[model samples]
Target: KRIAIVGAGQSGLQLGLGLLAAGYEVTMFSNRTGEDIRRGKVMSSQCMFDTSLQIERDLGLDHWASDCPTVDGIGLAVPHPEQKGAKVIDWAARLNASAQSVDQRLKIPAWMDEFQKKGGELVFKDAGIDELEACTQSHDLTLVASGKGEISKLFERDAHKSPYDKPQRALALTYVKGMAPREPFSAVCMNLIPGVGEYFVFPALTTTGPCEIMVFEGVPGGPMDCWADVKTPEEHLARSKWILDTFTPWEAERCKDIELTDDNGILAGRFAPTVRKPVATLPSGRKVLGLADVVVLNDPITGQGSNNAAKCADTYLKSILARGDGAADAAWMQQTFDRYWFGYAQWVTQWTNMLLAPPPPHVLNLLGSAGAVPPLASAFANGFDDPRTFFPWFADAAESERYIATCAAVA
Candidate 1:
């Protein structure tokens, strides 16, 4: 059987490679070459925990495992609203297994080079309806994985599943060097400010070298959301530091001497969190499946974008293999997505979107208490790997209260 995939990001490439390894012919339609994508600005923070990394290992795509920086843990800090530099809550917990991030500029081109060596066809073209139509005519399975592209608009928005029509956070990323690392071990150090937004920074391997990525998630119309008039890359870096110096002075101290990895390393944008129907019908009356963010776009507040993409690729790869010669028809496509959504991504979406909303009292209580409750902190930190463990306690106010009480007892 032959498989056709559009987009060359984590999901599309991974699925194509997995299919290729399984003795199927694979073709990839990409808008840009590795160099084109590499020359472009930064795309994502892309911190993948142990499980997502493991998925890559299963597919021999873990080529950068030894080279990328390891993120050893997760840290949470809430700056005191009243105090200039004091923190109301501060804690960090080591993850059960390490996490890592490789710059896509380096990873994407590398993967394409590898995919070709493995006998997959690579067509570099700006794919549209016409390209997809041609693929559906020849390939047994065709998928679109780049959710933000215009082509993805073909998938109907799931109004019931999508809660926010407008972007939730004003987002920005500053990739820089010379920043001080978190003590004892590296971590995704997060600082939460009530009514304002969140700031998270972690170590990653970029095209230049090892650098830390500063992620700013600012609530709309709030102080951190002010990035509209920033004209140039230098201005973007200055604004990033000023936001830290003003709001998260503790984090600012670490970045006092930081400099941008490159002019292109800075990014500022905002996008709505949305979920769409998993399958779309082309004008020619053929169906193509949507994968990853193409179907379930979520805010990066929880840092699951890459994780979601990798896991979606893993699930879809398995689902396709299980079809065993059956048609990759509309019904099979929905089952593939439903199997993934219900099995895992549903919890991820709910947890991430929940954080986009105001924190309930119980949720606030849990965050505030993690420092003292070491086991709870560990559970919370590790939950990023698989949010299914968050369950009733993380969602239900009543269960949260009970779970918090139980965790507090251990202290």
Candidate 2:
């Protein structure tokens, strides 16, 4: 079977590789250059940690270290001491085999080359589903994995029902050419402040150094998200200052010597108008899919975007493989979609939404006092580990019943 994939990003590349291994002739369509990916010039969704590592391992990309970084456990430093902050020891209870760097922070181009070397073809062209039908008239199957922007028409956001319509938030992150954590694991540590928005710091394994992505959630503009214009050098310095000054412990004196003198060499970005829309199927009876910031890339506050995409990809791939020759049937595709949707997608959606919401009084209490009560803190920390952890809670259940069940298990 001749299969054509729309995007050459992580998920698309993984899907293309998967099809190739299944003996299907696979071709990845991309318009960007290797420099776009390698230099971090693209407006990419930061994908790292265990999720990216798992997919790469599945593709046997053990040799492609390239320019990625490896991160240790998270260091949660609440900007406001009166508020709350806690670091989750990633390798604390983690098993021995899980200690190695997962390489989830690997550079995309690094793996892209590996995919091509393994007999997968990459076609550089500005291609879309409409264009594909015309170009690949002789092809058997066309897979549209065009990330987010390209597939907008299919999954339009319901502005009325969607939240996060204000204070167009931006995420500024970069990988330093500095030191590693001395430890070896990935983490999602949050630096929270009471009134001001929080910064999420996650360390992942990139081939270069530990990529310390300090994600500041709000942009200068109040709420309208329009990051079209590039930042001036002065503006870049100012923003970095804001990050250091605004977040605590990152006092100017402390970070004075830490600021990247040549920030141009570092990585940085902004993402806004975080929204979610239903995954749409094309009118051609071909089910078009978009993951990451495409279908529902919400706030980085949750730290589950990459994990959500990986889990979604797993289900989507399974559905496609299950359909066999007649995978194009709408009924089968939607059924497969519904099954996966119910199983994982919806719960993640709910959990992310909750995270975006300011921690409620009760939730904040649990976060702060959980330290004294280790079990309570552990629950919140574990849930912070991944959105999938909230599946049962989101699925449906009585909180009291759950507590009783936990007690029963312990007994």
Candidate 3:
């Protein structure tokens, strides 16, 4: 085969789709089955940036979520009314086909199956691609696409001259059914608690009924540090509850009446320290590539994980289609790292790190002195357009300034 993709995750599936379209025979290997999706398993925290949804739309997969809600608007419950709220900007999500719901995490396998139905191969095996270096003695070229840690160790970063060490931060998520407050389902809500952390509540479907995700962004060394501990699935629920009570305002009158669902229980959502330059070409000439949380992501603070993956996959698709199977060609290396990987990493890391660190003196003073303005809130809330076209959305994070700039630039 011309291309072999490891890990049937979102990034892997997208690469498979792109390679198949470019007239390349591809085989995708994964250890797990995508049947979990067919059985209705809540897959990797299910939310995509509006722009990421747009890419799916352009690919004719937007209709994939025909059953799930297509989040077009976002609503915020600024804990401090002083920190106003925002809605969908006029230009926001213009290309976002729509959002949908899925019960399982293996939607990726589902898509891969469809690719296979159309003539692609998905092998559910644990064989590592790096092991294929010797096998490449027979094939044309070999590529490794697993994320950092394992594959990365083999292709270590050149830190002595590299930019950043690719610092990684921790992330945790819970999919509870009864947590959100009763209300008109505002498209999306971001509830921030300055120092403690932030809460993002959104709606989706589950086997029981419509369910919501209660994502907690905990501060380092604070509470909610149980993700890595080896615990039964049931333990996730206990730990998540403890965190809500300790760090969040769950005990406050506002949230005291809120109910929680223990059906799915607590699940761990941990990520390793991210390495900015997770891409490395081996001396043997074969290369190991990083995808998703494995390589380029700042933190979950910006809620950009899946979106960044999709955009990164799109860049891979673009580079490959432009040059065909020669995608691994030395010339395409710069295109992949500089154009796609760097841009996506830059935009997300800036916003995520900013959210993790205390808002600047100016921002704190802004929220302390006055409430958030509608226009300003709307700009960033709806600002998930690809970074290449709109670079400032990632850098100029001041919501108020973004509000003004949105009007002048895209509006």
> What's the TM for model 2?
0.76
**What is the total number of backbone clashes in candidate 3?**
12
Instruction: Name the weakest run of 10 consecutive residues (lDDT summed) in model 2.
Output: 90-99
Runs in model 1 deviating more than 4 A are: none
Candidate 3 lDDT tens digits, 49-161? 66777676666655355556455555443344343333121111122333444433535656767778767777766645445454344433344455433543554543432
Per-residue error at 72 for model 2, in Å?
A: 4.3
Clashing pairs in 1: none
lDDT by residue (tens digit), candidate 1, 240-346:
99899888988988987999999999889999999999999999999999999999899999999889999999999999999989989999999999988888988
Tell me the lDDT of model 3 at 160.
35
Question: In terms of TM-score, which candidate is stronger, 1 or 2?
Answer: 1
Best by TM-score: 1
- State the weakest 10-residue window (summed lDDT) of model 3: 86-95
